[PDB]
């Protein structure tokens, strides 16, 4: 069982970049993790290595004392974060996949295979937005660079009523509107 | 152009 599983010691190093407002704001944080414990880190906003837990003092002290290493780390905001952002700008940041909108019988509007993440899916009854009986799933990450989201509508079909699912996404200049009648 | 990569600092024994 879990108590007699093989012993494992795990190490993780995460070099992360944070981008806001295009290239206006850039921040990096490198994380040194033992098992699941982040014990030391470098935050470009702080400018020096800092111990996060009792395991980090020896590391943060030693690394801040290495002039070249310290300068190299501070310089990664440029050699890594800024440098790679330009590369994202010509590939990832331009990736656009239009959502496929489908409605099936209470009523489920399936918005599948889209990218980026930003989307707005709403239900309308006779061109009037539904404010209740609407439940959406969280944004679903497929792992293959596409997302999915399902929004259901609890309704009592009365004759003549026309239900529509409105979907807005950056890959679309015009909202996608799908109708459904009983 | 080559992708950038963070380089880990080395612990002192």
């Amino acid at each position: 069982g879990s108590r007699d599983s093989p012993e494992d010691f795990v190490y993780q190093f995460k070099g992360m970049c944070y981008f806001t407002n295009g290239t206006e704001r850039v921040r990096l944080v490198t994380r040194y993790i033992y098992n699941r414990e982040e014990y030391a880190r470098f935050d470009s906003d702080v400018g020096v290595y800092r111990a996060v837990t009792p395991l980090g003092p020896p590391a943060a002290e030693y690394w801040n004392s290495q002039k070249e290493v310290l300068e190299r780390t501070r310089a990664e905001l440029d050699t890594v974060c800024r440098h790679n952002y330009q590369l994202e700008l010509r590939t990832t940041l331009q990736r656009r996949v239009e959502p496929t909108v489908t409605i099936s019988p209470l009523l489920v509007c399936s918005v599948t295979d889209f990218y980026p993440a930003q989307i707005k899916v709403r239900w309308f009854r006779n061109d009037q937005e539904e404010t209740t009986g609407v439940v959406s799933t969280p944004l679903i990450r497929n792992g293959d660079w596409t997302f999915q989201i399902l929004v259901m509508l609890e309704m009592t079909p009365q004759r003549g009523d026309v239900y529509t699912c409105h979907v807005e996404h950056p890959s679309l200049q015009n909202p996608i509107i799908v109708e459904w009648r009983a | 152009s080559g992708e950038g990569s963070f380089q880990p600092s080395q612990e002192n024994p």
Binding site: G1, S2, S5, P6, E7, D8, F9, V10, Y11, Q12, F13, K14, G15, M16, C17, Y18, F19, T20, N21, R27, V29, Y32, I33, Y34, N35, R36, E37, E38, Y39, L55, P58, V80, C81, N84, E88, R90, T91, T92, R95, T102, S104, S110, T112, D113, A117, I140, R141, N142, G143, D144, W145, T146 | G2, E3, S5, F6, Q7, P8, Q10, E11
Partner: protein, 182 residues
């Protein structure tokens, strides 16, 4: 924790004593751009677009991992050999697109809260193993430093088949079988 328009990991580095084994990959806004096969010493991009326009020196990854190994052994001692604690993983199965009998689809198996990063994810059809059309992502990072991984099974919806995503992990009391039907 940190809010930003975009978050990237230009260095999800992993190394663990069990095996031993390691992993090197880059992620942007939660998805994997690539991973470096440490055996074949090659970069494997996850999108045709990337494979076509960008490149990464596998050696940077290999060199980084040797450093994580050096760091791990030292922290293992500084922590008096505190070993990783197994987390209980959670499994979820869903289709990539709406299910219409006869039309090609893909079953997705999300395995979340994985730790340590060692796991077996396999598929079952009508109770028996299936390897044809199966694939999976690398271990994707999480801010709490556990991981998640997604497996895929390309299939053709039919009334003659029911599936199961089987997950084996040291943290479980028994193998997990998450069922899914057309």
């Amino acid at each position: 924790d940190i809010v930003a328009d975009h978050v990237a990991s230009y260095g999800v580095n992993l190394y663990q004593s069990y095996g031993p084994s390691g992993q090197y990959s880059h992620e942007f806004d939660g998805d994997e751009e690539f991973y470096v096969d440490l055996e074949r010493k090659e970069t494997v991009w996850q999108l045709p677009l990337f494979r076509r326009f960008r490149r990464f020196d596998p050696q940077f990854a290999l060199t980084n991992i040797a450093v994580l190994k050096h760091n791990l052994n030292i922290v293992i001692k500084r922590s008096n050999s505190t070993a990783a604690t197994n987390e209980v993983p959670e499994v979820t199965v869903f289709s990539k697109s709406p299910v219409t009998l006869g039309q090609p689809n893909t079953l997705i198996c999300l395995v979340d809260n994985i730790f340590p990063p060692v796991v077996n994810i396999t598929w079952l059809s009508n109770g028996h193993s299936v390897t044809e059309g199966v694939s999976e992502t690398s271990f994707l990072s999480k801010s709490d430093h556990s991981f998640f991984k997604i497996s895929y099974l390309t299939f053709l919806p039919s009334a003659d088949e029911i599936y199961d995503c089987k997950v084996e992990h040291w943290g479980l009391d028994e193998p997990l079988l998450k069922h899914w039907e057309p």
